Design a protein around this nucleic acid. Sequence first.
DNA 1: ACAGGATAAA
DNA 2: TTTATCCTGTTAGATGGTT
Lengths: 231, 485, 50
Amino acid sequence: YTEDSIRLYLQEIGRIRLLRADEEIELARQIADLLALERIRDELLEQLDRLPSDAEWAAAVDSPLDEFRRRLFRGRRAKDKMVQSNLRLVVSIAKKYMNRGLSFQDLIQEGSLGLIRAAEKFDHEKGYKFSTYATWWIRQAITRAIADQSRTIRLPVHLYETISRIKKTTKLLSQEMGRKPTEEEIATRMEMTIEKLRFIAKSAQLPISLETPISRLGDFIEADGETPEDE
Amino acid sequence: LLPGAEPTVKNGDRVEVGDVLAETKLTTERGGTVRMGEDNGSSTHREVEIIVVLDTATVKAEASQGREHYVIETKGGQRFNLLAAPGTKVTTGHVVAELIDSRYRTQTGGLLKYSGVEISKKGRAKAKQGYEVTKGGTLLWIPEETHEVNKDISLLNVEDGQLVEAGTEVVKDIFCQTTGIVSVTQNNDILREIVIKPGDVHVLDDPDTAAKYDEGRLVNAGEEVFPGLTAEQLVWAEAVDGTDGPLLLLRPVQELVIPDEPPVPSQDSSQESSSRSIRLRAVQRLQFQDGERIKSVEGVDLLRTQLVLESEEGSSQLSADIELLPDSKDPETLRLQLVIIEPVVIRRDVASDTTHGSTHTELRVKDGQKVKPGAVIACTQIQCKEAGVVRGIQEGSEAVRRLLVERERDCVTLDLDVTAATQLQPGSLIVAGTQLVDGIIAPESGEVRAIAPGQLQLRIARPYRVSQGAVLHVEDKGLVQRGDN
Amino acid sequence: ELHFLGKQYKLKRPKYDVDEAKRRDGTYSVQMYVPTRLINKETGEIKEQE
DNA sequence: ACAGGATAAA
DNA sequence: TTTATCCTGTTAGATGGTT
């Protein structure tokens, strides 16, 4: 009866055995069948402007309602197992950003979405291991989540990319010239105005908390209003 | 007195300054050869080591890719690689060196057959370490290249039983390395195992010949495999189902002959005083069992010749350090050596109030000497700082931890009349300030040592009153120093 | 493998000065440079640098 | 992280 | 016109934490 939540999640994960490549291929085939069936249903939804009933959906596949429903179930369970047995991969990738703005548990749950998408777009016919395709999606989901959920004043992804390129250019100039580059040099190298560079530098800052010891910061800030004297 | 120290004197022995009071004897537990450490700026060896030796080889330290590997050149010209680094302790049975051999290294995987070769049957857990051969013989090696994958069917490029050349992309991103027939294994539209086996192929026209080769067979050189077909060298003939039906495959069988005993010269221990001799036994191990069907794209090592540390029974728990001895005749030439070093630690002499006497340790042996088990190695003697009389050493069943020396300045003489002082006895307890005789008052307290005509000997003493119910931290006739409760 | 030969760390002379740092509201410091050697466990190419 | 594409807001 | 902001995809293999 531990109180830790991450350890409990890791235990819940460890109760699942890793898949094998043949198991991956089988599950990928069932997942593809489920995806095609879902696409058909979506077509029925466009035709009916409503959710099709199981009987209408079974009729759309010329399949007995029992056979159709069992096929649907198998596909659901296949996708479920594919995601479930790879959560360990999700944790292995998510542990590499535990100090960037999102807590470890948030990284895990955001990488789970990438794993789900990877399991939805895996192609067995490609002839590759699922652990190679899934890594890209897990990493992308975690990086996007960090870009969109790490700051109180959220910055767009293009701003993160701009800041990264500014850092790389600054390091390259420092290595080339053997000294710290100036603002004008960096602005010329980046082909952008110095005011834009200063704006990027100002927007990259982290907001300081009101309760920073100085005694707290929040007790030294005046209030917006009209002074009784000025009325 | 230190733990295990034994006094050399009895109660009452009048000793002089510097004389031995107590001694600690260090003895060798098992005996052997003495090794004295070099005088590293100290004229007193703080440690002495107990040691058999083997030398009759040559050793050179060569640097390859920044790694210092030791090559053991035997007097017969054979070469070994030293798998164990200097300073490492290994027990009995551990591999020390590996024969640098390439003859028994295959190019690819395949199948293994035994011919008269026999092995020891002790232990399955040693399978990773191989199988020790109990009798030499002939190994038959049937080559094959096995690509083990778990990939889907539609990636396949080659037909079951197609005769191929090496380099063909049999499966997407998989390249064959051997020119032969490809046999394909699939499970529910999933490619599992692909096999390429070299050897000549030939048409099977007569079903009876195929029935003879239903299970595969060996055929010697010159022996006619079937009418019109004679094997020029020993080959494995097996019936395989190719694209058009039955075919006969003649895979080239390799023969590797292993001698009954590894012909690598052992090096003999040179010291008889070690009743538990230590030696290097050369062993031959086959890493795979009879008929073990091996699947490997790259070559494997079949036979390994390993030097193994061996010792007499009862010494199985001994661990031997590994050292290099520079040869006396040629210092450049180094020789590998295994020692069962046993340490004996000598404490530095301390004369400053630890025992309150000078502790001096003298060795009882010389470097290179041969000692029996239990022989005394070192004697540490405690020398008294001040002459006097030794007391406080009680007898029986307890280790002497503290002794007492009553010195010249712990006795005082006083001029008192014997005639009327007859009320006192040697060993009386005199409280100072007490009227000993009419008009005579005790100047200082003490114990009555002697009563001479007109004189009195007092050993200085001081009392402490104790009331009923107190707790006693000490014992009668004990020994206490300054500050003790 | 990266090896940091930390027994040979050199120190670069402080920039500005003590008084210049005081009057500029900066920091009085030096720069630390340690020699390192990246060793490839196989190829064996060692790219020594500071 | 990085590249391509769609779009609307400046 | 010209960016500012959002969306989707990526094929060696990888698969349970630090303080």
